[PDB]
Amino acid sequence: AAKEVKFNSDARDRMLKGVNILADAVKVTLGPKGRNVVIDKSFGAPRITKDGVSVAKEIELSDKFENMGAQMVREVASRTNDEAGDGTTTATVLAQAIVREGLKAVAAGMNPMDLKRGIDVATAKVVEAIKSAARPVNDSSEVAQVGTISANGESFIGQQIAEAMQRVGNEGVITVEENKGMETEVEVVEGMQFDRGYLSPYFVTNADKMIAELEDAYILLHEKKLSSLQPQKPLLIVAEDVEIAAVKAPGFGDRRKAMLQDIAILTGGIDMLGRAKKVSINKDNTTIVDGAGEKAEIEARVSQIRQQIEETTSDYDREKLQERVAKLAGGVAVIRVGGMTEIEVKERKDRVDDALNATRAAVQEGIVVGGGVALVQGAKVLEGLSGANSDQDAGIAIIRRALEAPMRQIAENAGVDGAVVAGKVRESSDKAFGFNAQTEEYGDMFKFGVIDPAKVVRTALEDAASVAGLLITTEAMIAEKP
Amino acid sequence: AAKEVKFNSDARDRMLKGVNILADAVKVTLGPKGRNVVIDKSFGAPRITKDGVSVAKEIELSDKFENMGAQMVREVASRTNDEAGDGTTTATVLAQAIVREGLKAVAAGMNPMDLKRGIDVATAKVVEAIKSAARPVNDSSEVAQVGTISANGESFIGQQIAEAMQRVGNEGVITVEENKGMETEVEVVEGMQFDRGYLSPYFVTNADKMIAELEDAYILLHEKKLSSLQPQKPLLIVAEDVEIAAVKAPGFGDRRKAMLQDIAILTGGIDMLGRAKKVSINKDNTTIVDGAGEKAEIEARVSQIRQQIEETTSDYDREKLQERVAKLAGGVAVIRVGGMTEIEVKERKDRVDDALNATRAAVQEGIVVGGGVALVQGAKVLEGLSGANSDQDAGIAIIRRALEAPMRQIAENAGVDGAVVAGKVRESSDKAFGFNAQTEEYGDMFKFGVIDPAKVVRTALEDAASVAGLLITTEAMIAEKP
Amino acid sequence: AAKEVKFNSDARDRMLKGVNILADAVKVTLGPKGRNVVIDKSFGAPRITKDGVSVAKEIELSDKFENMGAQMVREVASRTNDEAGDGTTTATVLAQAIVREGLKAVAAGMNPMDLKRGIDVATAKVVEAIKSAARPVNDSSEVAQVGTISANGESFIGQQIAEAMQRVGNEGVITVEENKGMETEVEVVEGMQFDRGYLSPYFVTNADKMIAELEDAYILLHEKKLSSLQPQKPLLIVAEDVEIAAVKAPGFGDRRKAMLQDIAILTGGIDMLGRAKKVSINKDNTTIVDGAGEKAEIEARVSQIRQQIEETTSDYDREKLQERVAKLAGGVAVIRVGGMTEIEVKERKDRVDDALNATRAAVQEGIVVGGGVALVQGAKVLEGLSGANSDQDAGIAIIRRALEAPMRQIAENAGVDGAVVAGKVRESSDKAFGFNAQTEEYGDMFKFGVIDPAKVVRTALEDAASVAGLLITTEAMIAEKP
Amino acid sequence: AAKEVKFNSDARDRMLKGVNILADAVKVTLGPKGRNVVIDKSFGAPRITKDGVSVAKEIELSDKFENMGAQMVREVASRTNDEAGDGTTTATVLAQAIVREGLKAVAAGMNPMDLKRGIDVATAKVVEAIKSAARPVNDSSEVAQVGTISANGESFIGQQIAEAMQRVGNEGVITVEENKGMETEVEVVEGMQFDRGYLSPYFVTNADKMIAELEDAYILLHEKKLSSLQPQKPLLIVAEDVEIAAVKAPGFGDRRKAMLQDIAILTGGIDMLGRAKKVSINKDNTTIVDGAGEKAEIEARVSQIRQQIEETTSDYDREKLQERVAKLAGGVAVIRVGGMTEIEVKERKDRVDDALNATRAAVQEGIVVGGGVALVQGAKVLEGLSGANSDQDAGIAIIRRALEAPMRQIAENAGVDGAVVAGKVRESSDKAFGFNAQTEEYGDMFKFGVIDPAKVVRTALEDAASVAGLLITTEAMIAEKP
């Protein structure tokens, strides 16, 4: 219906308003000295939080335009949570800085498209200078050190994860779960994990995250779809689509029936159906732990695939078959958390699940100094960089400064003058020298124990500059009329 | 939907508004010279009260933000009522003082995180200096003196409680109940008392407190749950959970079935079900008085557990079994209040139940001078204490002064100049010297009969400083739009 | 929901507003020269009244706070109608005076708690000096003179009541009832009268007062309750409680079944049920006139109880049995009013019922000068009285003056200057000297025929000072938001 | 719910407003030169009237208070229509005068109670001086002259009524009814007429007045009531009450069954039920014309009662039996009006019914000069009268002047200066000298034909002063809030 079209600056000043609100509410909760954010709960007492991710979700401005600015940034920076980490809050604090400066420039006449270019270049140069400075994590002594730190010092969980990893490879398929008594173990059941999620969010039993947990469900599957539905154990349907668990079959093309088969054995597909002790479903990933099939039927498929790839001269499907075989000849580790009471097991399961997510991401691209120093350090690379024109150059300097945002903030929240903490780290020489807001001393961020998966310090920066560019190059907005 | 985000001071000044209203309405009802608070009743004449706990519940401000300030303080200070005492009103009067000063400081630039630190330190030092000054209560001459005082002088109830206690230990399981004629007795039936409450508040027969009273109910129990419900004596179900009485089974792990069994005999679990004359249920505690089992079946379990622990070399489960055995080899005392008419028995049952709650808490951590002097005395400890910086020091002084709040108030309400009553007690030498607002004379608070369970004068102070810290370190608030 | 909290004076000035409206509307209808109060009737012509009790009920102010002030005073002063008399209007006129002065003082700084004390003392001193000055009423010449005066001169009703009283003792159980022709008689049927009322007001057939009249009902009774209801003559159930007439069984403890039995015979408990010609029920008293049992079965119980108490060595239950026996060996007098037409019998029944209530209360504690002089006279006692301090002294003087309220009013309404009428009675010497507004002459209030049951001139004064103290010591009010 | 309480003058000025509106609208329609009052009809053209009684009913002011003033006066003055006459309009015009002056005085300080006294005295003196000046009407030459005048000169109706009266006594039971052809007759059927009306107004077939006309109904009657209703000729039930015609049985006490019997024969109580050609019911009077019983059964009862009273030595029930016998040995005359068309019979029936009502009231207390002169003449008596004080004297003078209201009005409406018409009649000597507004000449009001039943000129004056006293002594009003 009726629409309100805002053009030029009038549309930009409003986006900037919605972004600043979103960034100013989330950024107060950054670092070891974060401040709380009280959130009105429609029933009872208010929710007091420091988790910058729960704040971002609560933000919904009334003014259609201001809200669009917030909704966007908030959406992208939320994808930075694909690896679940402080990326969301950093993506946000970063976006706010770049956008703030970009529009300032745009206003002064600089060409937005160019700024967007100089912004894209400078970003790539840093997204690189970061990787080329991240210490790797492969050894079990490291994977156990990154597992502990990510658990605030729980040397017990650092080893627990290292174990599971050293049982199914640094890039396996772990699944932390609660147990009974005070006994923690790392079993390795025979299960699988597709690369697809659910069909509808309403199909989720969201307890903490959008993940559907189904104990002893009914694993069925056909090469058709779920058109007509006319035709004490949960169910799980895996097909093309729908015109209880509902997930799309794994694989594609000639690998369609094959994939359905590989898993068919894993579950054993009521007498002619597959079974599984547990089956978890997510957005774009579903795991089936403890199937039902028999090692024999499972050893056959793995044998077929082996001999299959043993004949394949195809340099392409060589991996498409060698990869589907690992989903069988690999297994599914599963840390079993246990304590005294439910107030313990359910508690440690959150710490382990939280620390096992930081490590799994630490091993992918390595680890790098935390405290928002990685960004300031990598920014050193933009020293002599130059673009095709003054405008393009501006975009580069914007990023050169935006990278100091998450650090000065973290410093300000602690009471220290971020302008100083930044200047010291800038004039630094040791690529691992920063400021530790926890104790308030400068030094080797690594020796300090202040580290961050390089995969999040990288995704945050890309995602930020991703939107900062869109916003900066937006000329008109169309919102519905009240 | 739409949200109103308040930042910095703008969000603090509002919280302070909601807290001051809540604290100013409750604190008028403090001490022996408390003033009344008239409460509009939606039907009939207004409710006139002096009970600062009934006032706190009635407070619900209209302004979303102001209400959050009140809702918080009011929530925490309500947990101080876990031991049921003047803690709620004191936690409140204290919180209001600390917060008032904290924000004042914050405003002047002092770092909130530091103030929060100096506040936390100073508090621990006092929460300690209090315990290390509380006269213990173990002897039956004491437990009967604290039982009488807590009953305004009813030497009859002081002994009544002392008896029940000297029959099931200072830390047993008493249950005051109404009788028939003018006869008071302390029987010791065979019952139990888990450490779990109900599942839903709507399941409570709230007559005065959130406690479910079930006479001759049906005690059933299985190792499953209450998923499908499809499959003249009340009922009580004890299982894992529900997907009439409903409570979660006691114990955990290998102690699950064991616990269910220990109680199974106590009730005798229709021919294959357990029974009990009375079963009370609370928030996190359920009591089963007068079961149904036979001394024989009960003497067997106690015998098994004995021989069981007699073999256990485990230095851990040694208590996990020795404790579950006491739930059987202990019994459940039960004071039987009796008078002339229902206007008597129902009256004395409230005095006994009220005095038996003050004692049961007096024996846990001892007793200490009442009248809000314990706090002012312990505050003496902060004399030379110092923090890492001026800011941290400020937090310490805030507490040094906030502790004089409940006393000056109690004095002002009586007509005496709290500034003076405080100065005298400050320059005091005898750790038991204070001011008795009842008679208006200074002296030995103990000889005076003005005492307070050290467990409440301690919980109040911790809880207050608990929120005073959260509020002081809150940077942004998010409330829904009208 | 949302609440408006008023503190200090702001809350007091509002209460005072609601009280003054209530007292100013009711007090215009005081004495022999009362003025009318027109009351809007939702249908037809307005109700013209002089009865200060019907006015008090109509008062409901719109402002939540002002209304609380009125609702309170109006509630207490309504209990003064427990003996049904001009107490309500006097309690009100008195409360208004004390409160008016109290808050005035409070405002000047005087301590409310103290004023409340000096008010309580002075009151007791007068509530006493009154009793110790009331001429007794025992003789039938007196009980018939107080019975006539209370009937505006109906010497016929003065004797009618005296008779019934001289047939069942000055403290018996009379029950005035309508007859047929112009014949008035005082029969003495065999009935009882418990000390309990009904369970629900909606169970009342309120014709004039909250009294349930049941002719030939079904008297049943068991030692259980009215839990499940599943299992041309009205019914009446008497049990513990309910989970047509419904009343709780009489007695307690071992006297439970006994009481139910004593009455069981009185009614004869369909073939195995008790019956009764008439059964009236009130708030806390139920009467059963003309039962059904036979003198024999009734003479047996009385015989058992006699021999029972004849053996009882108990100096306690000696009365608990001797009293329950009188409920049988006493009877129930019953004045039978009769006239020409229903416009007569129904008219005289109101005069007799109204005069028989003033006498029954006159014999309990005696009679004392009316016209509001008793109060002014007793106030003489406070001549030298003194409290612990100036504040306490103030409370005493407030009462010393408030007692002149109902008299000056009664005088003003008549056209006489209450300041003068008060001064004369003050300088008086004869404790029975006052002012008779009916004729406008001073003298012996007793010889004048201006008397008041000392029980109402006493209850009014206690009830007034009861609330005047609560209001004066109220610091905060909580009302719901519009 | 919420109430608005108006006190003192503020409440009086408003009542006076509602009265003045009511009196000013009605009084324009007074006398032979009355002006019309147009009344908006919710459908069609407006109703043009001169009947001051139809105007009074239409008055309903919006302001709660103003309306109370009108509703009251309007109610009382309506009872003056008990004898159906110009009393209503006169009661009103009078009330307005007294009240207007009373409040004026009250305002000046005069005591209302006294004024009310001086008003009551003076009124009695006149209500008397009137009777002691009314020519009687007993002869059929007179009863026929008052019957004609009351019919604007219809000498035909003057005799028609005289006849019916001379057939059933000057105080019999006449019932004018419509006939068929142009034939008028005065039959004397055998019927009765109790002294009771109906139970509910909704039970009325109101055609012109609240009177239920039932032709050939079913006359039933029992000594019980109409509790349970479960158990081409109309019906009529006569019992105690109800828990088609519904009326309460006649008589009382031992005369209950007797009365029901006396009428039982009159109707003959389907085979065992009483019948009657016609039965009319009113507010407090019911007539049964042309019963069904047989002269024999009727002559028996009359015979029994005769012999009954012939033995009764009772000087009391001598009339209670002699009166009930006349209800049988009397009969019920009934003028039968007839004309040419329904536009005639229905027209003359209104004139006869209207004139037969003025006569029936003229014979009760006589007749006196009309034109509002009776009042002015009787006022002469207050010449030397005096009360206990100046205030009481004022009340007397108020009445001395209010009595000239209906006359000056009647004069003003005609165009003559009421101040003059009053002065002449005042200085008059002949107690029958006045002013005839019809012709505009002074003289002998009697010879003029200007007369008024002394019963209405008396009731109007009593009723007026009745309320004028209530209003004048009203101190507070309570109306509901909008």
SS3 track for C49-115: ECCHHHHHHHCCCCCHHHHHHHHHHHHHHHHHHHHCCCHHHHHHHHHHHHHHHHHHHHHCCCCHHHH
> How far is the CA of A29 from the CAs of B10, D121, D361, in angstroms?
18, 91, 98
As given in the structure block, the two tokens for residue C26 are: 């009711």
> Could you tell me which of B43, B51, B118 has the C-alpha nearest to residue B402?
B118
How far apart (Å, rounded) are the C-alpha atoms in residues B373 and B445? 8
> How far is the CA of D22 from the CAs of A447, D34, D70, D97, in angstroms?
101, 16, 6, 12
How far apart (Å, rounded) are the C-alpha atoms in residues A247 and A194? 10
As given in the structure block, the two tokens for residue D405 are: 């209201």
Chains in contact with chain D (at least 3 beta-carbon pairs closer than 8 A): C
The reply to whether D315 sits in an annotated binding site is: no
Backbone torsion region of residue C366, taken as left when φ is above 0, otherwise alpha when ψ lies between -120 and 50, otherwise beta: left
Contact call for residues C77 and C464 (beta carbons, < 8 A): yes
CATH match for B1-136+367-482 among 1.10.10.10, 2.60.40.150, 1.10.150.120, 1.10.560.10: 1.10.560.10
Phi and psi dihedrals of D193, rounded to 5? -160, 100
User: Chain C residues with CB inside 8 Å of D473's CB?
Assistant: 35-36
How far apart (Å, rounded) are the C-alpha atoms in residues B64 and A94? 31
Sequence-ordered list of residues with C-beta below 8 angstroms from that of C271, at least 6 positions apart, any chain: none
Q: Which residues pair with B242 in a beta bridge?
A: B226
How far apart (Å, rounded) are the C-alpha atoms in residues A401 and C462? 81
How far apart (Å, rounded) are the C-alpha atoms in residues A145 and B263? 46
Q: What is the DSSP letter of B437?
A: T
Degrees to nearest 5, angle at CA C77 with C76 and C83: 105
> How far is the CA of A129 from the CAs of A376, A399, B384, D67, D471, in angstroms?
11, 14, 52, 92, 100
> Could you tell me which of C380, C355, C362 has the C-alpha nearest to residue C434?
C380
The SS3 of residue C316 is coil
Contact call for residues B442 and B424 (beta carbons, < 8 A): yes
> Could you tell me which of C203, C305, C306, C312 has the C-alpha nearest to residue C247?
C203
Burial class (CB in 10 A: 0-12, 13-18, 19+), D447: exposed
Q: What is the DSSP letter of C44?
A: S
Q: Are strands A47-49 and C3-7 parallel, antiparallel or unpaired?
A: unpaired
> Could you tell me which of B119, B199, B163, B159 has the C-alpha nearest to residue B469?
B119
How far apart (Å, rounded) are the C-alpha atoms in residues A312 and A315? 8
How far apart (Å, rounded) are the C-alpha atoms in residues C161 and C176? 9
Within a 13 Å sphere around the CA of B381, how many CA atoms are in the beta-carbon half? 22
The reply to whether A87 sits in an annotated binding site is: yes
Contact call for residues C434 and C446 (beta carbons, < 8 A): no
How far apart (Å, rounded) are the C-alpha atoms in residues D400 and C40? 32
Domain boundaries, chain B: 1-136+367-482, 137-190+329-366, 191-328
User: Chain B residues with CB inside 8 Å of C63's CB?
Assistant: none
> How far is the CA of D43 from the CAs of B232, C282, D54, D209, in angstroms?
67, 53, 17, 21
**Orientation of helix D155-168 relative to helix D342-365, angle to 10°:** 60
Contact call for residues C174 and C360 (beta carbons, < 8 A): yes
> How far is the CA of C22 from the CAs of B192, C16, C79, C242, C375, in angstroms?
57, 10, 16, 38, 22
Cα four-point dihedral sign D391, D392, D397, D403: positive
Contact call for residues B244 and B173 (beta carbons, < 8 A): no
Chains in contact with chain A (at least 3 beta-carbon pairs closer than 8 A): B
As given in the structure block, the two tokens for residue D470 are: 């209530």
Task: State whether CATH 3.50.7.10 applies to domain A191-328.
Answer: yes
SS3 track for chain A: CCEEEEEHHHHHHHHHHHHHHHHHHHHHHCCCCCCEEEECCCCCCCEEECCHHHHHHHCCCCCHHHHHHHHHHHHHHHHHHHHCCCHHHHHHHHHHHHHHHHHHHHHCCCCHHHHHHHHHHHHHHHHHHHHCCCECCCCCCCCCHHHHHCCCCCHHHHHHHHHHHHHHCCCCCCCCEECCCCCCEEEEECCEECCCCCCCHHHCCCCCCCCEEEEEEEEEECCCCECCCCCCCCCEEEECCECCEEEECCCCCCHHHHHHHHHHHHHCCCCCCEEEEEEEECCCCEEEECCCCCHHHHHHHHHHHHHHHCCCCCCCHHHHHHHHHHCCCCCEEEEEECCCCHHHHHHHHHHHHHHHHHHHHHHHHCEEECCCHHHHHHHHHHHCCCCCCHHHHHHHHHHHHHCCHHHHHHHHHHCCCHHHHHHHHHCCCCCCEEEECCCCEEEEHHHHCCEEEHHHHHHHHHHHHHHHHHHHCCCEEEEECC
Q: How many residues does chain C have?
A: 482
How far apart (Å, rounded) are the C-alpha atoms in residues C333 and C165? 8
Annotate A63-98 with b (16+ C-beta within 10 A) or e (fewer). ebbbbbbbbbbbebbbebbebbbbbbbbbbbbbbbb
As given in the structure block, the two tokens for residue A60 are: 């919904």
Got the DSSP string for B171-204? TS----EE-SSS--EEEEE--EE-S---S-GGG-
Contact D478 C61 (CB under 8 A): no
As given in the structure block, the two tokens for residue A349 are: 């399961």
User: Chain B residues with CB inside 8 Å of A46's CB?
Assistant: 68, 71-72, 477
Contact call for residues B105 and B9 (beta carbons, < 8 A): no
Cα four-point dihedral sign B453, B454, B459, B460: positive
How far apart (Å, rounded) are the C-alpha atoms in residues D371 and D452? 8
Contact call for residues A454 and A366 (beta carbons, < 8 A): yes
Residue type, C208: D
How far apart (Å, rounded) are the C-alpha atoms in residues B49 and B40? 11
Contact call for residues C31 and C407 (beta carbons, < 8 A): no
How far apart (Å, rounded) are the C-alpha atoms in residues B335 and B164? 7
As given in the structure block, the two tokens for residue C368 are: 């004392």
Contact B474 A35 (CB under 8 A): yes
Contact B478 A37 (CB under 8 A): yes
The SS3 of residue B336 is strand
CB atoms within 10 A of CB B284: 10
Q: What is the DSSP letter of C208?
A: S
Sequence-ordered list of residues with C-beta below 8 angstroms from that of B124, at least 6 positions apart, any chain: none
The residue behind tokens 């009960």 is: B298
Degrees to nearest 5, angle at CA C332 with C327 and C333: 150
Cα four-point dihedral sign C181, C184, C185, C186: positive
> Could you tell me which of D136, D213, D218 has the C-alpha nearest to residue D176?
D213
Contact call for residues C96 and C15 (beta carbons, < 8 A): no
The residue behind tokens 């109007």 is: D460
Strand order in the sheet with B47-49: B47-49, B36-39, C474-480, C3-7
Contact B38 C111 (CB under 8 A): no
Phi and psi dihedrals of B235, rounded to 5? -125, 155
CB atoms within 10 A of CB B78: 18
The residue behind tokens 């009814």 is: D177
The reply to whether D431 sits in an annotated binding site is: no
Burial class (CB in 10 A: 0-12, 13-18, 19+), A154: middle
> Could you tell me which of D225, D223, D219 has the C-alpha nearest to residue D241?
D225
Sequence-ordered list of residues with C-beta below 8 angstroms from that of A272, at least 6 positions apart, any chain: none
Q: Which of A17, A40, A60 has the most B C-beta neighbours within 10 Å, making it the best mutation to test the interface with B? A: A40
Annotate D281-313 with b (16+ C-beta within 10 A) or e (fewer). bbeeebbbbbbbbeeeebeebbeebeebbeeee
The reply to whether A86 sits in an annotated binding site is: yes
The reply to whether D175 sits in an annotated binding site is: no
Closest alpha carbon within chain A to B253: A181
> Could you tell me which of D157, D137, D186 has the C-alpha nearest to residue D334?
D186
Contact call for residues B55 and B21 (beta carbons, < 8 A): no
Got the DSSP string for C238-258? EES-B--EEEEPS--TTHHHH
Contact call for residues C332 and C175 (beta carbons, < 8 A): yes
User: Chain D residues with CB inside 8 Å of C29's CB?
Assistant: 475
Q: What is the DSSP letter of B242?
A: B
Contact call for residues B417 and B411 (beta carbons, < 8 A): yes
> Could you tell me which of B189, B193, B187, B158 has the C-alpha nearest to residue B173?
B193
Ranges assigned E (strand) in B255-371: 274-281, 286-289, 332-337, 367-369
Method: X-ray
A-to-B residue pairs, Cβ atoms closer than 8 angstroms: 88
Residue type, B290: D
Cα four-point dihedral sign B170, B175, B176, B179: negative
End-to-end CA distance of chain B: 10
User: Chain A residues with CB inside 8 Å of B477's CB?
Assistant: 37-40, 46
Contact call for residues B367 and B349 (beta carbons, < 8 A): no
Contact call for residues A176 and A353 (beta carbons, < 8 A): yes
Contact A38 B476 (CB under 8 A): yes
Q: Are strands A367-369 and A451-453 parallel, antiparallel or unpaired?
A: antiparallel
As given in the structure block, the two tokens for residue D58 are: 């239409």
How far apart (Å, rounded) are the C-alpha atoms in residues A334 and C463? 75
From the list A48, A181, A415, the residue facing B114 with the nearest CB is A415
Residue type, B392: Q
Does C touch D (3+ CB pairs < 8 Å)?
Answer: yes
Considering only CB atoms, which residues of chain C are within 8 Å of chain B? Answer: 1-3, 5, 7, 11, 15, 64, 68, 71-72, 74-75, 111-114, 228, 252-254, 391, 470, 473-481
How far apart (Å, rounded) are the C-alpha atoms in residues B370 and B364? 16
Domain with residues C137-190+329-366, CATH architecture: 2-Layer Sandwich (3.30)
